[PDB]
Design a protein around this ligand. Structure first.
Ligand SMILES: [Zn+2]
Lengths: 130, 211, 44, 101, 48, 417, 174
């Protein structure tokens, strides 16, 4: 009220590890329990699945040539796999870039390619745009 | 060889002053130009910095404007006295008030009619608040070196009452902090202190003893 | 104050003529052109 | 000029009212862009300023009569204490600054 | 009037950080369309 | 300046006032010296700027041109405006519709009545000459005062003579400072409430108020200011307020214009003006301290002496506008004031007005109303109402009787010698 | 409509979103039965600080139309992952998210900058675990200051309310 500063309570615990670590822990604890549901992709995954194919996709990117320093560019429209890519690129430490697809042309695409200078381009063929 | 060139330049100066080639505004190139108007002649006159140091008059911070309107001709017998007080106040305190307050915009007008009642319009930082219009009321027992200070006191208390009447000051405060600089058109001759900006600004620095 | 530089002396001169001729610095002398209305309101 | 703070007691010469005047810190002109002619005369005037404003024409403004004039007379504090301690308390109100009872 | 407290805010690093910031905004501006330009440079070299 | 309060459907016609050089301006200087009386009026008009050139945008149908005609001591400017205005009117004669030309009887009566008028026409003209020889004085400066009298200079000289007629200068600006606009508006509503029961609607329509905004040169618009009118424009608002007033009025020009003449000549009277008289402060509420609320009697007397003078030119100039053939060769030859205002009213309206003025003047003279201390007396207003109603109910039913009234009371109104 | 028909099948006990697409749900939720929403209890909408302040009557509209127990509004700049402060429907007070400090400072300091007077516009600094001081650019990966006190520059200017409320602004341009 008197001065401009605002603070929240500090009693809440803070998680400082990597992402893959909590994925492994949560995969050991609840293995068969559901993680995400998607009807339009027919995706019903457990924590089993998310761990398994997260690091599987990580290896996939490793053999596709990705390295811990460089970037990925991803234009995918509301899939599960952009999240999976979040985890995969987290595991190999590559910076993932997610750009909005709702207004996309050649010019700003080549702007993104100029900016991030990605190793990979995660794209579509037919994408749905308003 | 500085002395004779100096002489040369002085005689040259007086020559152009007799023949009307002399531009008195050259030091002032970077400043915006005040209103060319029938009452605002208090603006174009180059003010010594010393008598601006002499008249230090502050009003309430919530004042944004002071207008002084007076009739060119006064039909009324006492009309002349009122006009003279208004004229004197418009010439003596309008520029200084502006100078020190710096958010207050000050304008005087010579409006051409026979009317004996000059008035002063005070605006506060509220847009929603009506301006206060104070009449000039010379008492017939008061000369023109006294009544002017009386009008000054009236303007000060008017601005103060106008500023303490303000709906919530949070708004007025931020509007005040962000209101741009109003005293830019003032032309000041800095005499014996012109050498660096810090004594150009010397009227800002105030010594506070016994804190 | 004895000025050891010429500009020091014009400073001295300026404060001096602010002191001795002070009638120069009263507002009526600043207003010599207006003892009346503005100069364009006149006759020829 | 000026490196150190100093307090002075000055008398307004027109109305004879004593007010106090202070001189604060203003920095040396830059040592890296060097000017001997600036620095040295600044030094001599600094020494002068420190001693009672000996060669300086004092210019300030009276509070009791508000105008800027150089009529001021600089008083060393013993002359001040000679001037002050012989005064009735009602003329301390007129001649001196607030309080100073 | 203008006095500062004893524990006084720093001007040196605020300066270094803001002017550096200025330099990198300039870099952000200058780097727009860089890859195409650097593509044409090689073609001009080969032509020359 | 000759016909106040006459109004007509008009279109805005842009006119560039002068030619001047930015560095050295003769125009601006001479005007600013001579144009003081309505300054705000010169301040409000648009300033059109061209390379090394200055111009001011004028609306001919607006009262601005009339103000230029009155207050400008420059011959060539007012001459340019005059000639270009006459040329514009003559050029508009082809494009504009044929004049109404209501009745041959009115034309005959006006023709026979107009013949005698030039003796005193020479009197007033040589009076304008005597005023022009003395026109150069400390107060007013002219380029050549000895120069021959022309058709463009009439209004200016008229002003000089009226100012000379007034024992106290400047009565115009004094009375203006005293009289508020809204005050006279509300008191004209009171006048309507008392004179005509449940008549004259409520207020003027948007078209009429916009017209009056175009019919008046406005004042300083600054904070804490009340709009004020010159006595002449007070007479203008007063008669224009009477034509458009009446609700139950059928469509006839003479009947409803008679009210106009009545309220105009009511604004001419000293007692009414002094009765309505207030200061700026009492109406504005700024200063509750005032020695005298009412206009000083001398100023009123002066103001009244202003509007009465030059009856002959007042008659003849308007007589030119009765018919377009009468307006064809009399614009150059006959003394007249070119006005875009009366152009649209040319045939029926101007003539009917010319008769109505005389028919009202008969009432004014025969009743000796000018010196009446209380003009709001009941009997007076009753008789006034019945009078206007009768004269209105006559000419439609019987024309030649009204012709007789016009002629006889014309011999009465403007004295022969 | 297909969205509602899916979410009422999938048995979602609570869902997330933004105002602009809850608009479409509000258009087409009236066409369905009330009890079809019986599983939805709470809902969340996220707010960028340049929105300011989704009105609480809108929240009331959501809660009454979907048969909701509580509507949660989170707000914060995009650097903060859209959470700095938050409110419920029943609680209008803006509670800070835990482990978050928001301060508004002057311009003359980095670490040693001073807190302003709680209405005055000055720089904004956020300290929290979920706050990011890096941003990617044409040049590459970039970072603004994280200082000795642990706070972090956002390069944004803000105004604090008396009651907990942040208002972001563009940079000061006089
Ligand atoms: Zn003194």
């Amino acid at each position: 009220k008197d001065y401009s500063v605002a603070s929240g309570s500090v009693d809440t615990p803070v998680l400082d590890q990597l992402v893959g670590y909590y994925v492994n822990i949560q995969s050991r604890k609840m293995y068969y329990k559901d993680f995400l549901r998607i009807e339009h992709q027919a995706v019903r995954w457990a924590f089993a699945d998310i761990r398994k194919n997260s690091e599987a996709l990580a290896h996939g990117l490793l053999q596709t040539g990705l390295r811990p320093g460089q970037r990925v560019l991803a234009i995918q429209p509301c899939n599960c796999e952009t999240f999976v890519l979040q985890l995969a690129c987290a595991k190999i430490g590559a910076l993932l870039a997610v750009v909005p697809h709702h207004n996309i042309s050649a010019d700003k695409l080549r702007f993104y390619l100029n900016e991030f200078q990605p190793h990979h381009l995660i794209a579509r063929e037919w994408i749905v745009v308003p | 060889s500085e002395r004779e060139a100096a002489q040369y330049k002085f005689i040259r100066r007086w020559e152009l002053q007799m023949r009307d080639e002399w531009d008195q505004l050259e030091p002032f190139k970077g400043l915006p130009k005040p209103k060319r108007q029938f009452g605002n002649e208090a603006a174009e006159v180059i003010w010594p910095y010393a008598l601006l140091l002499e008249r230090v008059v502050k009003v309430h911070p919530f004042t944004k404007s002071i207008y002084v309107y007076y009739a060119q001709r006064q039909s009324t017998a006492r009309g002349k006295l009122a006009a003279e007080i208004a004229r004197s106040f418009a010439r003596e305190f309008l520029i200084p008030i502006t100078f020190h307050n710096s958010q207050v915009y000050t304008e005087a007008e010579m409006l051409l009619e026979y009317s004996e009642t000059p008035w002063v319009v005070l605006h506060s930082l509220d847009n929603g608040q009506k301006p206060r219009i104070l009449p000039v009321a010379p008492v017939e027992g008061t000369p023109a070196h006294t009544a002017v200070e009386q009008l000054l006191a009236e303007v000060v208390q008017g601005c103060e009452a106008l500023g303490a009447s303000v709906a919530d000051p949070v708004t007025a405060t931020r509007v005040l902090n962000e209101r741009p600089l109003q005293n830019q058109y003032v032309r000041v001759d800095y005499q014996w202190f012109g050498d660096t900006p810090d004594e150009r600004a010397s009227h800002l620095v105030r010594w506070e003893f016994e804190p | 104050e004895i000025p050891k530089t010429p500009r020091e002396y014009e400073k001295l001169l300026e404060r001096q003529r602010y002191d001795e001729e002070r009638w120069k610095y009263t507002i009526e002398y600043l207003f010599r052109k207006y003892e009346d209305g503005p100069p364009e309101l006149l006759d020829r | 000029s000026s490196r150190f703070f100093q307090k002075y007691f000055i008398r307004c010469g027109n109305c004879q009212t004593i007010q106090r005047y202070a001189k604060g810190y203003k920095p040396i002109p830059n040592p890296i862009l060097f000017d001997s002619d600036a620095h040295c005369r600044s030094y001599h005037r600094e020494r002068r300023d420190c001693t009672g404003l000996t060669g300086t024409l004092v210019t300030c403004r009276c509070d009791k009569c508000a105008r800027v004039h150089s009529h001021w007379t600089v008083m060393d504090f013993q002359e001040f204490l000679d001037a002050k301690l012989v005064m009735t308390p009602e003329e301390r109100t007129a001649l001196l600054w607030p309080g100073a009872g | 009037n203008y006095d500062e407290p004893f524990f006084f805010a720093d001007f040196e690093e605020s300066k270094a950080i803001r002017d550096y910031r200025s330099r990198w905004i300039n870099v952000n501006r200058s780097l727009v369309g860089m890859t195409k330009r650097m593509k044409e440079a090689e073609e001009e070299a080969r032509y020359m | 300046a000759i016909r106040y309060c006459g109004e007509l459907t008009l279109n805005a016609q842009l006119v560039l006032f002068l030619l001047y050089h930015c560095a050295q301006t003769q125009r601006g200087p001479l005007k600013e010296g001579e144009m003081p009386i309505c300054p705000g009026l010169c301040g409000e008009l648009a300033a059109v700027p061209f390379r090394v050139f200055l111009g001011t945008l004028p609306t001919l149908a607006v009262e601005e041109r009339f103000l230029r005609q009155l207050q400008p001591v420059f011959a060539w400017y007012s001459s340019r405006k005059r000639v270009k205005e006459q040329a514009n009117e003559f050029i508009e004669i082809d494009l504009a519709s044929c004049d109404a030309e209501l009745l041959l009887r009115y034309s005959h009566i006006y023709y026979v009545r107009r013949q005698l008028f030039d003796e005193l026409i020479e009197r007033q003209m040589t009076l304008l000459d005597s005023g022009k020889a003395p026109k150069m004085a400390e107060p007013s400066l002219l380029q050549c005062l000895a120069g021959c009298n022309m058709t463009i200079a009439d209004r200016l000289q008229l002003e000089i003579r009226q100012l000379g007629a007034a024992k106290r200068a400047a009565s115009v600006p004094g009375r203006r400072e005293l009289d508020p606009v809204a005050r006279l508006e509300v008191y004209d509503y009171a006048c309507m409430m008392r004179l005509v029961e449940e008549d004259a609607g409520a207020v003027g329509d948007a078209e009429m108020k916009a017209r009056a905004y175009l019919p008046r040169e406005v004042i300083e618009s600054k904070l804490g200011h009340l709009t004020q009118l010159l006595l002449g424009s007070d007479a203008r608002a007063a008669l224009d307020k009477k034509d458009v007033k009446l609700l139950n009025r059928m469509i006839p020009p003479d009947y409803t214009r008679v009210g106009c003449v009545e309220k105009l000549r009511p604004f001419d009277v000293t007692a009414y003006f002094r009765f309505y008289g207030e200061r700026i402060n009492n109406v504005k509420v700024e200063n509750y301290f005032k020695r005298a609320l009412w206009g000083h009697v001398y100023r009123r007397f002066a103001t009244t002496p202003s509007f009465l003078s030059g009856v002959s030119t007042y008659w003849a100039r308007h007589s030119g506008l009765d018919a377009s053939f009468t307006t064809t060769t009399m614009p150059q030859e006959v003394a007249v004031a070119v006005c875009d205002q009366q152009i649209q009213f040319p045939a029926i309206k101007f003539r009917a007005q010319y008769v109505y003025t005389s028919p009202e003047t008969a009432r004014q003279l025969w009743r000796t109303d000018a010196a009446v201390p209380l003009m709001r007396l009941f009997p007076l207003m009753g008789s006034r109402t019945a009078e206007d109603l009768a004269a209105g109910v006559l000419t439609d039913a019987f024309w030649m009787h009204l012709g007789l009234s016009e002629e006889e009371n014309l011999l009465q109104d403007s004295l022969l010698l | 409509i297909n969205g509602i028909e899916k979410l009422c099948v999938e048995e979602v006990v609570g869902m997330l979103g933004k105002k602009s697409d809850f608009d479409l749900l509000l258009r087409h939720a009236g066409n369905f039965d009330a009890d079809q929403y019986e599983h939805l209890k709470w809902v969340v909408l996220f707010e960028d600080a340049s929105e300011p302040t989704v009105g609480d009557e809108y929240l009331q509209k959501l809660a009454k139309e979907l048969g909701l127990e509580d509507v949660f509004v989170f707000r914060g700049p995009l650097e903060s992952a859209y959470m700095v402060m938050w409110r419920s429907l029943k609680r209008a007070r803006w509670e800070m998210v835990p482990h978050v400090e928001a301060k508004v400072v002057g311009d003359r300091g980095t670490a040693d900058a001073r807190i302003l007077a709680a209405n005055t516009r000055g720089n904004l600094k956020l300290k929290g675990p979920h706050i990011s001081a890096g941003y990617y650019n044409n040049a590459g990966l970039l970072t603004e200051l994280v200082d000795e006190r642990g706070f972090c520059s956002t390069s944004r200017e803000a105004v604090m309310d008396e009651r907990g409320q942040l208002t972001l602004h563009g940079t000061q341009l006089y």
